[PDB]
Amino acid sequence: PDSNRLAGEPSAYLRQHANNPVHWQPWGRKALDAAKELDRPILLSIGYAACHWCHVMAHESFEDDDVAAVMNAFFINVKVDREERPDIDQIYMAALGAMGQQGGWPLTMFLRPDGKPFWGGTYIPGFVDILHAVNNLWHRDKDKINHNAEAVFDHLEGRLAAQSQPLQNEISRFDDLANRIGSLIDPQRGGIEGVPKFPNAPFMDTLWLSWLYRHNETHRDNFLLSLKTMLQGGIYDHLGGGLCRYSTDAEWLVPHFEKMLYDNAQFIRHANYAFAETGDDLFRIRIEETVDWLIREMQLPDGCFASSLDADSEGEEGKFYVWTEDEIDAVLGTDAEVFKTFYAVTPGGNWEGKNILNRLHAAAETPTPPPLVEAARRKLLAHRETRIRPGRDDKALTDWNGLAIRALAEAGRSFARTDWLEHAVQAYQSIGSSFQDGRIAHCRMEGAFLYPALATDYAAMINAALALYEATGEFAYIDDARKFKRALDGSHRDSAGNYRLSALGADDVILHAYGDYDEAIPSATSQIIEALTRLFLATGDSALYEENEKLIEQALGRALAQQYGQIGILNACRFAGEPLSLLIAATDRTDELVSIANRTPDPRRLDKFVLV
């Protein structure tokens, strides 16, 4: 507690806070214990890299030398990344809402030595006023904190780690959910009509699953309009490729220029399924452009994919991705007129006087660029790469890598793109290299691994291993899927058969939550339901089938008690209640039956092959 130990950590978001004068500590047993022997409170700060206001609180307070000594003598201050320890975030995010104050990131908390919180807040501006007031309260009111900490804690243990009575899996529960999700779709712009606009991968899954199981063409058109209009807006990089996080306005125009790995992997699957229904060439182009961007800018020397790249370059939001007309005319030359007519370039611009490239003005026309404006588009990228390039988060998250490995495996299978498979295998063997002592790591960077993993890490690697089987047909990927299943059971399955996000042997966690709340990615148990359901179709394990039906009813029992974020559970249980299985006997990959199965991607079906 007298030296900043945030150096060498696998999270790049914490590495930037290493030079801070406050002795930052990582979340671990050595941090909580020191708070006991010194009877000093804990000050927890949660944040993620692509958050403009996590850096604001840094330069305003934490990077200031004076206010850090106030923290160094009053608490044991710890910094956590929302994406390195998502278990810690979800615990103390729901802890804030239970105190009667909603908030987001950064999140500043106050913890007694055992970890239970008693006061929190989003961003703290008097900051130092409280920074001492809690220290006063820590000494003046030990009786008040113990009364207040265990009251919020009992609300957490009942909201995040309390099993419910089993609930019967019924079809009408999903059809009801699909009707209400459909009523939130903006009929003209696409997506949830509220602003800001998020891609909302779980919300899309319900509409597509509604279209497949019910042939409800209304939700199918809601899925297609929302996906297609988004991929045409400024939220997508029409020059290099890759989708951004979310949109500021409802027209999908002005975005947050950070590019997350999970959002790109989750739309490749959506666009892949969407191509098989409409044949619209735009879905294929967006997939092909984003995959090239993933290999070029996200893939690490070892093959694994980085987490994300920054939205800020050289100190301004999106300086790297936006153009003015006077510069694109200087580089292109005579071919500059047709380029500006393609991406709605205007002298006045569409964002703060600048021009963000988009294809919303001609979204229904042909998506393929003419040969002159394609060479003009490629020429700008070579000139754009000379700019001050935004920083990258080289942290290799196992759960996020599994999402991408599954995306490249399924899209490469349907489009017969053999190059996409090889890069999926490289990321597979790179992530799978950390599997030692019957366990895998959560994240990794610069040779530093974070153990133990989370339940999402095994579920994602189970789904990626099974996807690699469908594309290849090598049964060694099914054996890998069972190896990940055994590791998941040995560390996350409780006595009731339920799975919990944090490992049961992890000692630095207050609460072993199930992980039932979705975000941009479906929840942990949501992914686990799907992964185990697909693993049954690939093996025929009857004991797995019997334990899955229990797991389904347990999760549905808690999902009924949830107020939000249960969409992934109802989606996975709808698929688990009626899965599709297809065995194909063939003599080679060129067989007709194998081909029409490849050209028919279905998230509800798992393919199996036998030599004949």
Provide the token pair at 28.
């671990």
Provide the token pair at 282.
């735009």
Residue placing its CB nearer to a copy of itself in the complex, 13 or 174: 174
Among a copy of itself, Cl ion, none, the one that 184 touches (CB under a kind-dependent 5 to 8 A) is: none
Among candidate residues 268, 197, 277, 208, the one with its CA nearest the CA of residue 233: 197
User: How far apart (Å, rounded) are the C-alpha atoms in residues 183 and 199?
Assistant: 16
Among Cl ion, a copy of itself, none, the one that 172 touches (CB under a kind-dependent 5 to 8 A) is: a copy of itself
Provide the token pair at 595.
């081909």
Q: Does the protein bind Cl ion through residue 520 (CB under 5 A)? A: yes
Q: Does the protein bind Cl ion through residue 565 (CB under 5 A)? A: no
Binding mask 521-560 for Cl ion (x = CB under 5 A): x---------------------------------------
Under 8 Å between Cβ of 243 and 231: yes
Among Cl ion, a copy of itself, none, the one that 349 touches (CB under a kind-dependent 5 to 8 A) is: none
Provide the token pair at 528.
């686990």
User: How far apart (Å, rounded) are the C-alpha atoms in residues 453 and 487?
Assistant: 10
Shortest CB 578 distance to a copy of itself, Å: 4
Q: How many CA atoms lie within 13 A of 347 on its CB side?
A: 0
For residue 421, CA distances in Å to 520, 558, 608 come to 25, 38, 18
Shortest CB 582 distance to a copy of itself, Å: 5
Under 8 Å between Cβ of 70 and 414: no
Among Cl ion, a copy of itself, none, the one that 596 touches (CB under a kind-dependent 5 to 8 A) is: a copy of itself
Residue placing its CB nearer to a copy of itself in the complex, 17 or 604: 604
Report the interface residues with a copy of itself, using CB under 8 A. Answer: 171-172, 215, 438, 476, 479, 482, 486, 490, 536-537, 539-546, 576-587, 591-593, 596-597, 600, 602, 605, 610, 612
Residue placing its CB nearer to a copy of itself in the complex, 155 or 493: 493
User: How far apart (Å, rounded) are the C-alpha atoms in residues 526 and 519?
Assistant: 11
Shortest CB 410 distance to a copy of itself, Å: 15
Shortest CB 21 distance to a copy of itself, Å: 47
Helix (H) or strand (E) holding 312: strand 312-313
- 162 Cβ neighbours under 8 A, 6+ residues apart: 558
The stretch near Cl ion (CB under 5 A) out of 17-25, 205-213, 518-526, 549-557 is 518-526
Long-range contacts of 589-594 (CB under 8 A, 24+ apart): 589/473
Helices 371-384 and 325-332 pack at an angle, to 10 degrees, of 110
Among a copy of itself, Cl ion, none, the one that 520 touches (CB under a kind-dependent 5 to 8 A) is: Cl ion
Residue placing its CB nearer to a copy of itself in the complex, 400 or 575: 575
Among Cl ion, a copy of itself, none, the one that 543 touches (CB under a kind-dependent 5 to 8 A) is: a copy of itself
Chain-centre distance of CA 267, in angstroms? 12
User: How far apart (Å, rounded) are the C-alpha atoms in residues 443 and 308?
Assistant: 13
User: How far apart (Å, rounded) are the C-alpha atoms in residues 440 and 555?
Assistant: 25
Provide the token pair at 391.
């920083």
In one-letter notation, the amino acid at residue 258 is E
3-class secondary-structure state, position 595: helix
User: How far apart (Å, rounded) are the C-alpha atoms in residues 171 and 546?
Assistant: 20
Shortest CB 584 distance to a copy of itself, Å: 5
Among Cl ion, a copy of itself, none, the one that 386 touches (CB under a kind-dependent 5 to 8 A) is: none
User: How far apart (Å, rounded) are the C-alpha atoms in residues 195 and 151?
Assistant: 35
Residue placing its CB nearer to Cl ion in the complex, 185 or 524: 524
For residue 472, CA distances in Å to 271, 398, 429, 501 come to 21, 22, 15, 31
Among Cl ion, a copy of itself, none, the one that 586 touches (CB under a kind-dependent 5 to 8 A) is: a copy of itself
Shortest CB 567 distance to a copy of itself, Å: 21
Residue placing its CB nearer to a copy of itself in the complex, 400 or 609: 609
Binding mask 467-506 for Cl ion (x = CB under 5 A): ----------------------------------------
Among candidate residues 360, 328, 326, 366, the one with its CA nearest the CA of residue 344: 360
Residue placing its CB nearer to a copy of itself in the complex, 183 or 587: 587
Among candidate residues 93, 404, 381, the one with its CA nearest the CA of residue 263: 404
Among a copy of itself, Cl ion, none, the one that 576 touches (CB under a kind-dependent 5 to 8 A) is: a copy of itself
Among Cl ion, a copy of itself, none, the one that 579 touches (CB under a kind-dependent 5 to 8 A) is: a copy of itself
Among a copy of itself, Cl ion, none, the one that 519 touches (CB under a kind-dependent 5 to 8 A) is: Cl ion
Residue placing its CB nearer to a copy of itself in the complex, 164 or 539: 539
Residue placing its CB nearer to a copy of itself in the complex, 104 or 438: 438
List the one residue from 519, 541, 547, 553 that touches Cl ion (CB under 5 A).
519
Residue placing its CB nearer to a copy of itself in the complex, 211 or 305: 211
Residue placing its CB nearer to Cl ion in the complex, 321 or 517: 517
- Kindly provide the residue ranges of all beta strands, DSSP E only, lying in 83-202, ordered along the sequence: 107-111, 117-121
Footprint of Cl ion on this chain (CB under 5 A)? Answer: 519-521
